[PDB]
């Protein structure tokens, strides 16, 4: 949930070539593969039902479905630490819920806010500054860092430049295998 709902959101802009096919998808395939879906009861739904609303960041919709009746369902209490496993967990949520603006909500963002972004997610400002810092050196977002002002203009305009290269995603498979047909033949 913390190495899937983050990792493959950077190549899931119709940019598939990092595919990990042993994950929640063992569940995610089958418990959206039905029609009548209301309040979750089991572990897998009561995990997936706020996973999908951790996807569309919703920073408290993602958290406060992991701390209702799980505590007696042997998630929170069952570990011989009461509020320290959740203090580990919900911190690990509050950090992977600024790293949602990173890959997800950056579309038509030309100006960006930073004081209020950590105040919104009620986290230590530096603790959510250092992973957005990580995202520049690791994820290399089409955005520009100027952190003496504590703002970043993005200039992210690949909006429909990315779709004729969605037609190149395959002209890659064209180009990959014409670098493989003679390997076949000769």
């Amino acid at each position: 949930y913390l190495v899937s709902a983050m990792l493959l959101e950077i190549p899931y802009m119709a940019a598939h070539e990092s595919d990990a096919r042993r994950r929640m998808i063992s569940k995610q395939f089958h418990h959206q593969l039905r029609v009548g879906e209301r309040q979750p009861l089991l572990g897998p739904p009561e995990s997936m039902r706020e996973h999908v609303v951790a996807a569309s960041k919703a920073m408290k919709m993602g958290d406060w479905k992991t701390c209702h009746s799980f505590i007696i369902n042997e998630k929170m209490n069952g570990k011989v630490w009461d509020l320290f496993p959740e203090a580990d967990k919900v911190r690990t949520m509050l950090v992977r819920k600024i790293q949602e603006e990173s890959l997800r909500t950056y579309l038509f963002t030309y100006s960006s806010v930073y004081d209020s972004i950590s105040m919104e997610t009620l986290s230590d400002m530096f603790e959510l500054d250092l992973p957005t810092v990580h995202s520049i050196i690791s994820k290399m977002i089409i955005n520009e860092e100027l952190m003496a002002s504590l703002d970043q203009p993005t200039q992210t305009v690949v909006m429909h430049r990315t779709e004729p290269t969605a037609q190149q995603n395959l002209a890659l498979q064209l180009a990959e295998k014409l670098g493989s047909l003679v390997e076949n033949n000769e």
Binding site: V133, I136, I142, E145, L146
Partner: protein, 419 residues
């Protein structure tokens, strides 16, 4: 890697010449003391490397430095007592015991040329065993050692004497501050370690730390000589499993060689497969100054890191070993963290950055154009604004694949119309 299967038995069960003590409790430079201490326990009984440690501080006890090496280097220890009025007159066996040799001494000091200039290999064999025992007895006697291991080398017990007396050759020549002797011994330590031995993980730890010892006190062009201490023995950051290896300047040299003479583009050696796993992380939690060279690099901070590393370089410059690289790595660390800035960042004012950088605007502006000629900053400047505009993004890169589709398979098509 694979050493841990057995060495879980050991965990440093070696035993060497300097056994227990290094000059005890200090005030400050508390880290340097323990990473001084353990290499001191496992290198050799030094002999102004303790005078190096005495200088910085002020205490009292200069007593167990060179006194606990009796047989040779007798002047240091004999003065040491009334140096600060120490009644340790108990010094009186060396003069009598080594004086007894003097008959055999005069015999075999001339039996030198009986084997040498005659060109004998059998009157060699006679003097060889006597010299062999003589080299272990008392050894500075770097004159005897430089005459021994230069000419025909091999010694009857090809393990014990060729190990101990050649480790004593490296000792004595370093104790007189010889470096040409140290660089032939550099290789004579490359020889003995890769002989190798019976070579239980026990004396493997001896061997790996043996090729850390000589470049602890870097003296040569070690910007070359660190490529020598980077390319041997399952070449780790440390070289041992021994997760608590307290000989840990191997990364200071790694980084020096790769940033000073080499570049860090081209850092794949130093950062990717030398760091995050186990033992760099161990020494990261040890260190106060060098911890942030990786800690605030794995945090990727933009100004806060370069500031903290400037405050770290204020005591990285407090390293007064045989350093050969103090101000070198200082301005190389500044270069590095500003490369980690320009590689990602947009553009920002010289005058305020010069407050972040501990410098002035005129130094910033020309140095930024010096980065233009470095080929590390690929951008353009303006007049005076101090706003060096970097506009690094691709322009619709499809002519790359245009070439890939045709220039191979089209040239492959005409290959078979010769029919």
């Amino acid at each position: 890697y694979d050493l841990t299967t057995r060495i879980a038995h050991f965990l440093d069960r070696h035993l060497v010449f300097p056994l227990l003590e290094f000059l005890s409790v200090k005030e400050i430079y508390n880290e340097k003391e323990l990473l001084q201490g353990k290499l001191d326990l496992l290198s050799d009984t030094n002999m102004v490397d303790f005078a190096m440690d005495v200088y910085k501080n002020l205490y009292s006890d200069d007593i167990p430095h060179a006194l606990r090496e009796k047989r040779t280097t007798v002047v240091a220890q004999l003065k040491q007592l009334q140096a600060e009025t120490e009644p340790i007159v108990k010094m009186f066996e060396d003069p009598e015991t080594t004086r007894q040799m003097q008959s055999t001494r005069d015999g075999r000091m001339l039996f030198d040329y009986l084997a040498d200039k005659h060109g004998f290999r059998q009157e060699y064999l006679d003097t060889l065993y006597r010299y062999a025992k003589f080299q272990y007895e008392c050894g500075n006697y770097s004159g005897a050692a430089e005459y021994l291991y230069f000419f025909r080398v091999l010694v009857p017990a090809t393990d014990r004497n060729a190990l101990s007396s050649l480790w004593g050759k490296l000792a004595s020549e370093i104790l007189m501050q010889n470096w040409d002797a140290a660089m032939e011994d550099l290789t004579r330590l490359k020889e003995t370690i890769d002989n190798n031995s019976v070579s239980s993980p026990l004396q493997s730890l001896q061997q790996r730390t043996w090729l850390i010892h000589w470049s602890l006190f870097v003296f040569f062009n070690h910007p070359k000589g660190r490529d020598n201490i980077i390319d041997l023995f399952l070449y780790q950051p440390q070289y041992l499993n021994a997760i608590q290896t307290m000989c840990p300047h191997i990364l200071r040299y790694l980084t020096t060689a790769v940033i000073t003479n080499k570049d860090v583009r081209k850092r794949r050696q130093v950062l990717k497969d030398l760091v995050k796993v186990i033992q760099q992380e161990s020494y990261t939690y040890k260190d106060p100054i060098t911890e942030f060279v990786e800690c605030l690099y794995v945090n990727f901070d933009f100004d806060g890191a370069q500031k903290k590393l400037r405050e770290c370089e204020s005591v990285l410059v407090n390293d007064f070993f045989l350093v050969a690289c103090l101000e070198d790595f200082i301005e190389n660390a500044r270069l590095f963290i500003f490369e980690t800035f320009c590689r990602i960042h947009q553009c920002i004012s010289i005058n305020m950055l010069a407050d972040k950088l501990n410098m002035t605007p005129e130094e910033a502006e020309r140095w930024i154009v010096n980065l233009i000629r470095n080929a590390r900053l690929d951008a353009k400047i303006d007049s005076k604004l101090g706003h060096v505009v970097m506009g690094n993004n691709a322009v619709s890169p499809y002519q790359q694949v245009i070439e890939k589709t045709k220039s191979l398979s089209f040239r492959s098509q005409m290959l078979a119309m010769n029919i």
